[PDB]
Amino acid sequence: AVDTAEQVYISSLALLKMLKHGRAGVPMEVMGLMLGEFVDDYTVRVIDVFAMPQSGTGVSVEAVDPVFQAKMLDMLKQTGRPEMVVGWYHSHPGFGCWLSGVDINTQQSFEALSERAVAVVVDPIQSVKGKVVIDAFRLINANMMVLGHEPRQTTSNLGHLNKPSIQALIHGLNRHYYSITINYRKNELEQKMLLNLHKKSWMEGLTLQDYSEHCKHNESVVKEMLELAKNYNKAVEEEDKMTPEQLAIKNVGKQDPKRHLEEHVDVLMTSNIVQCLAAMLDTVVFK
């Protein structure tokens, strides 16, 4: 009985507790615990995340408070749901993700206690634009050290979700742990109530921004579009057989031919239509 290509399920609230606790203590490598359920042999799920108080030692086994462990679990049994811990996490701000020296020491304690106890490393400050730098890892033994680690077998969902990155494989990858696959438990009864409630405005759709700011904009764009038409005349009346595909590449200027064309005309079209349709509907509805 040995590993395969596993799968990690995370709940929607779990990821939100990761990025919020990472954004809170952005300099000093925050630490917390990960609470879920072992559903089968080789897929792990997590439903809940609660953090840890800050220890002066740092991210290690000494940052784990056993009296804050059991008494926090004492409350969650009688309210919500009791379940077994399945792992832990921390935050590593100075890089993306790889298990460091004091990372790997406290991992050995957890895999001695649990079956797997999957680590999770998240950089909070790298994730900016629309994506998150989250990845989960899991330590390997020394029994197959001259053999091929990660004993994976009959599947084809292993080549996805990441190739081993060179900022991560320069450290303990791949002869020390292995990387694991993470998708999201995307659910209904949460997805639309997050979407429609976060981005919404009722009366904005038929406002006017009315005319003194708008006729000035219609005044402006036509004036350079006149000179854009004069520059459009200049290339059309030119029309010389100087190998015109080579004549165009020696006359590149980030300019007229069709790019600096009707793009403005489309904006002039859409602005006045939405302005006039809002004007005509408002005369219709109100008295």
Partner 1 sequence: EFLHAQEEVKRIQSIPLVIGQFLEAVDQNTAIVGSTTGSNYYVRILSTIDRELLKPNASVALHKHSNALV
Partner 2 sequence: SLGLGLAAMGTARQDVYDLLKTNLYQDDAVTGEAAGLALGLVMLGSKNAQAIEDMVGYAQETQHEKILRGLAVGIALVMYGRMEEADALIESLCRDKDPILRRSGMYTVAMAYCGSGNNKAIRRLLHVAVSDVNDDVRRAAVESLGFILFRTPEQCPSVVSLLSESYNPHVRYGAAMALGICCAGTGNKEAINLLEPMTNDPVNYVRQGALIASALIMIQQTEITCPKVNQFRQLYSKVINDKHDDVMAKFGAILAQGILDAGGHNVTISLQ
Partner 3 sequence: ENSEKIKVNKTLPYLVSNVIELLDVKCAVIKTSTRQTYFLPVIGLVDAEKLKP
Is 92 marked as a binding-site residue? yes
Q: Which uninterrupted H or E stretch holds 15? A: helix 12-24
Closer Cβ to partner 1, 238 or 263, answer by number: 263
Options 33-41, 97-105, 113-121, 133-141: segment touching partner 2 (CB under 8 A): 33-41
Cα 51 to its chain centre, rounded Å, is 21
Helix (H, G, I), strand (E, B) or coil at 34: strand
Under a CB-based contact definition with an 8 Å cutoff, are residues 180 and 6 in contact?
A: yes
The option from partner 1, Zn ion, partner 3, none interacting with 130 (CB < 5 to 8 A, set by class) reads partner 1
Q: Which does 239 bind (CB under 5 to 8 A by kind): partner 2, partner 1, partner 3, none?
A: none
Distance between alpha carbon 47 and the CA centroid of its chain, in Å? 19
* 149 marked among binding-site residues: no
With CB under 8 A as the contact rule, the residue among 27, 40, 56, 75 that binds partner 3 is 56
- Assess 272 for contact with partner 3 (CB under 8 A): no
What is the separation of C-alpha 109 from the centre of its chain, rounded to a whole number of angstroms? 31
154 binds partner 2 (CB under 8 A): no
Question: How far is it, in rounded angstroms, from Cα 173 to Cα 179?
Answer: 8
**CB-nearer residue toward partner 2: 192 or 223:** 192
User: How distant, in Å, are the alpha carbons of 69, 102, 107, 176, 177 from that of 145?
Assistant: 35, 21, 18, 9, 11
* Interface pattern 27-56 for partner 1 (x via CB under 8 A): ------------------------------
* 103 touches, from partner 1, partner 3, Zn ion, none (C-beta below 5 to 8 Å by class): Zn ion
Using CB under 5 A as the binding rule, whether residue 103 contacts Zn ion is answered as yes
The dihedrals phi and psi of 33, each to the nearest 5 degrees, come to -115, 155
Binding partner 2 (rule: CB under 8 A), the pick from 78, 79, 143, 156 is 156
Q: Which residues contact 105 (CB under 8 A, 6 or more apart)?
A: 60, 61
Residue 55 found at the interface with partner 3 (CB under 8 A): yes
Annotated binding-site ranges for Zn(2+): 90, 92, 103
